[PDB]
Amino acid sequence: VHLTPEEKSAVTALWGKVNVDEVGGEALGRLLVVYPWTQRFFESFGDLSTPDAVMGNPKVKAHGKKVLGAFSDGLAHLDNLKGTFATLSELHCDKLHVDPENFRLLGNVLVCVLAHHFGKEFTPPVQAAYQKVVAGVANALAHKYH
Amino acid sequence: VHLTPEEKSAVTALWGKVNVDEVGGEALGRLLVVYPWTQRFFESFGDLSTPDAVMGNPKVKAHGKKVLGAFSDGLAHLDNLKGTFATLSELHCDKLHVDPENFRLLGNVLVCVLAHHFGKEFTPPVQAAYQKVVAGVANALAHKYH
Amino acid sequence: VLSPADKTNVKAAWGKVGAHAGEYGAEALERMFLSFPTTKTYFPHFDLSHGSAQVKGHGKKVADALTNAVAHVDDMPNALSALSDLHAHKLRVDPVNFKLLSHCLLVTLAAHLPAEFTPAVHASLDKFLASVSTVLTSKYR
Amino acid sequence: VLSPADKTNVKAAWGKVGAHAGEYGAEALERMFLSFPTTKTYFPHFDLSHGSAQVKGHGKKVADALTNAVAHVDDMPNALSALSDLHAHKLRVDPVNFKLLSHCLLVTLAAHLPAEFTPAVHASLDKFLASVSTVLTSKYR
Numbered sequence: 131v132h133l134t135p136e137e138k139s140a141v142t143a144l145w146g147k148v149n150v151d152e153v154g155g156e157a158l159g160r161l162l163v164v165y166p167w168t169q170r171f172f173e174s175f176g177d178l179s180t181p182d183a184v185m186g187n188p189k190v191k192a193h194g195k196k197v198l199g200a201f202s203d204g205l206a207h208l209d210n211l212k213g214t215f216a217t218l219s220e221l222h223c224d225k226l227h228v229d230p231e232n233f234r235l236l237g238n239v240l241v242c243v244l245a246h247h248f249g250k251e252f253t254p255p256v257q258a259a260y261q262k263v264v265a266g267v268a269n270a271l272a273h274k275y276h
Numbered sequence: 277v278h279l280t281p282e283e284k285s286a287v288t289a290l291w292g293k294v295n296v297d298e299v300g301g302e303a304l305g306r307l308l309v310v311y312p313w314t315q316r317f318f319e320s321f322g323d324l325s326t327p328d329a330v331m332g333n334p335k336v337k338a339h340g341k342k343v344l345g346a347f348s349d350g351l352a353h354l355d356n357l358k359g360t361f362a363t364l365s366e367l368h369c370d371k372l373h374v375d376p377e378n379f380r381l382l383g384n385v386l387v388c389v390l391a392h393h394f395g396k397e398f399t400p401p402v403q404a405a406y407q408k409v410v411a412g413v414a415n416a417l418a419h420k421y422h
Numbered sequence: 423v424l425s426p427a428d429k430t431n432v433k434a435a436w437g438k439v440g441a442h443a444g445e446y447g448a449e450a451l452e453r454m455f456l457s458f459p460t461t462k463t464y465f466p467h468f469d470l471s472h473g474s475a476q477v478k479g480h481g482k483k484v485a486d487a488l489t490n491a492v493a494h495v496d497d498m499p500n501a502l503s504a505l506s507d508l509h510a511h512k513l514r515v516d517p518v519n520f521k522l523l524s525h526c527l528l529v530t531l532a533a534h535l536p537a538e539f540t541p542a543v544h545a546s547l548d549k550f551l552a553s554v555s556t557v558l559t560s561k562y563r
Numbered sequence: 564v565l566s567p568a569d570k571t572n573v574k575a576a577w578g579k580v581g582a583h584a585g586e587y588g589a590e591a592l593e594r595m596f597l598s599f600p601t602t603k604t605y606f607p608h609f610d611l612s613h614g615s616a617q618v619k620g621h622g623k624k625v626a627d628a629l630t631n632a633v634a635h636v637d638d639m640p641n642a643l644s645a646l647s648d649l650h651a652h653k654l655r656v657d658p659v660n661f662k663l664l665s666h667c668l669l670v671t672l673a674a675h676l677p678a679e680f681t682p683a684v685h686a687s688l689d690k691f692l693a694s695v696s697t698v699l700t701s702k703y704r
């Protein structure tokens with residue numbers, strides 16, 4: 131993706147403050163609640179029957195942490211997202227057969243969670259830079275569809 | 277760029293019986309009628325107020341022929357759809373900013389048109405083969421978004 | 423949401439399906455399964471072989487549900503509430519799959535009813551099936 | 564189709580916006596314009612510079628429309644009929660842009676009303692904006 135040096139600084143500064151224990155779990159969790167059909171990919175995760183159950187689910191928090199780790203790796207290699215997510219794309223496309231639409235939803239749920247956590251610090255220019263990031267990640271996860 | 281040998285045989289055999297002067301106009305015309313927001317990209321084409329106006333619009337039928345000609349070019353290079361539609365991808369994505377979902381919609385409209393004209397001869401296996409065609413075309417046209 | 427003209431077109435076209443309900447239903451399902459094989463995973467314990475009696479039966483159920491939807495187009499969320507429980511709460515069907523079946527339903531109608539599948543009727547049918555899909559994919563109980 | 568819970572969630576949450584209509588409406592627009600530049604092509608005659616008086620005033624119109632939509636959640640097509648004619652018939656806005664604005668509305672609400680923006684309320688707000696979006700992009704008259 132193409133981030134201005136001013137955008138990269140704002141992205142980096144915000145990301146450095148991200149609670150890596152919770153933010154990923156909340157993003158993945160909100161995905162499962164707002165878009166319930168995504169739960170079908172997580173049958174072995176136990177109880178997803180209610181919103182409270184999804185958010186508090188230890189397997190959701192744990193897996194969400196891995197999701198946030200992928201975004202962290204993407205930020206560290208913005209010049210090669212296709213190569214950085216090459217393995218993850220093989221998994222999500224060939225094996226799991228996840229619809230590319232779902233990739234964009236999660237990216238945007240992550241945005242909402244950042245907005246939720248940082249409030250006014252999540253300014254429109256900061257959002258704009260993060261939208262470039264999540265679009266690039268979502269696309270890099272789906273090249274093996276292309 | 278994919279399709280089994282049998283799928284390629286099925287697509288090629290049917291396309292040989294396709295009226296290259298009519299089908300493209302039908303497909304584009306139905307796109308504009310079924311998904312009316314698409315008309316916004318064709319405001320220089322004249323009257324698009326009613327279904328009959330659209331389907332009878334000379335500029336729609338003429339442009340549809342170009343569109344279908346590009347599909348023919350795709351079918352002659354099924355293992356290289358990205359390169360075949362490379363220039364068109366630049367136009368539709370960078371210059372026209374057509375959302376890629378519309379690419380899929382036109383593809384499926386074309387499938388409906390094929391079904392409409394061939395009827396029973398448009399068998400499920402023939403359709404499945406063409407679904408891979410139009411998905412490949414849509415993907416190739418959205419490549420500059422990737 | 424459907425225009426009065428849309429309701430008129432849908433009722434007119436689907437009415438001409440009539441006794442071909444199960445056939446068109448089954449054909450649309452088989453088209454979906456063959457064109458988009460990932461849809462088969464929603465039916466893990468089904469016999470999905472070509473010309474399957476189960477698929478024949480299930481296509482009849484789908485078609486008859488659509489006939490019901492058409493008769494209750496002004497009260498669809500009420501009429502399809504049980505089907506909504508099934509698809510949205512229990513099955514949690516990904517809405518992209520409804521697009522695929524609706525498309526295959528259009529393909530089937532166009533393949534069997536060329537004279538009735540006009541651009542206006544096509545558009546009306548597409549919007550109608552989109553309405554049905556939203557109702558069935560949404561939890562409103 | 565909204566559930567009785569969705570309606571309850573939306574009224575309580577959107578009810579907290581209050582005098583912040585112009586601000587949040589404006590902010591949601593600026594977030595959309597900045598994050599998704601292609602949406603600006605619908606506003607060529609507009610002053611889309613940061614902090615413009617035109618965007619801020621338009622934000623108030625959009626927010627108020629949503630407030631009206633909330634109040635008429637059980638008869639939205641009638642209530643939004645004028646706005647539908649504007650967006651579907653005249654402007655012919657691609658539905659994808661409504662998804663972008665809806666997303667920016669959620670971001671704004673999350674940034675300003677963290678206590679309100681629970682997962683369930685997030686789901687309800689998203690379904691609400693989706694419904695508003697479908698009505699404004701559908702030609703049903």
Ligand code: HEM
Pocket residue numbers: 168171172174196197198200201218221222226228232233234236237267268271
């Ligand atoms: C859009 C950004 C996404 C990111 C960054 C992401 C990241 C990841 C990561 C890091 C893993 C771990 C893979 C491994 O350890 O081998 C994973 C696995 C997985 N992902 Fe995603 N993912 C994304 C989207 C999605 C979506 C949208 C879905 C479903 C709707 C999904 C479904 C799954 C499933 C089912 C697994 C494996 C679960 C298991 O092992 O039991 N992913 N993903």
Ligand code: HEM
Pocket residue numbers: 314317318320342343346347364367368372374378379380382383413414417
């Ligand atoms: C999905 C397969 C599609 C194919 C194969 C295709 C093909 C073409 C071709 C061959 C041209 C002529 C380019 C030139 O001569 O410079 C063209 C132009 C154009 N296309 Fe497409 N197209 C597709 C989809 C779409 C869609 C979905 C839209 C809008 C919703 C669209 C909008 C346009 C516009 C606005 C032009 C230029 C019109 C003009 O010159 O006045 N295309 N396309």
Ligand code: HEM
Pocket residue numbers: 461464465483484485487488505508509513515519520521523524551554555558
């Ligand atoms: C217009 C769209 C649809 C209609 C009208 C429809 C209607 C129905 C009906 C009438 C039933 C049987 C209810 C009963 O047995 O009491 C059913 C079941 C079912 N449908 Fe659908 N459906 C639609 C779309 C879909 C799609 C797109 C999928 C998946 C890709 C799907 C997956 C299923 C499944 C898994 C069952 C349960 C079958 C079983 O295990 O017995 N439906 N649907």
Ligand code: HEM
Pocket residue numbers: 602605606624625628629646649650654656660661662664665695696699
């Ligand atoms: C999603 C919910 C939306 C709501 C509630 C909404 C509401 C409104 C309202 C209240 C007006 C003012 C009309 C009047 O006062 O006469 C308006 C105008 C307008 N809207 Fe929207 N709108 C929405 C989405 C969109 C989107 C996504 C776009 C484009 C990307 C858009 C483009 C426009 C344009 C171009 C105008 C005309 C402004 C002018 O020239 O004065 N709308 N809308």
Ligand SMILES: COC(=O)c1cccnc1COc1cccc(O)c1C
Pocket residue numbers: 423424494495496497498499549552553554556557564697701
């Ligand atoms: C025609 O719709 C209905 O029957 C009806 C009646 C009362 C409440 N909700 C509805 C549902 O409408 C929808 C739902 C989803 C998409 C759509 O395009 C429409 C018109």
Ligand SMILES: COC(=O)c1cccnc1COc1cccc(O)c1C
Pocket residue numbers: 423556560564565636637638639640693694695697698
């Ligand atoms: C939201 O408005 C209503 O529920 C309502 C009330 C009376 C008639 N038609 C409607 C239409 O519903 C829709 C329309 C479009 C999308 C959607 O998800 C719903 C529930």
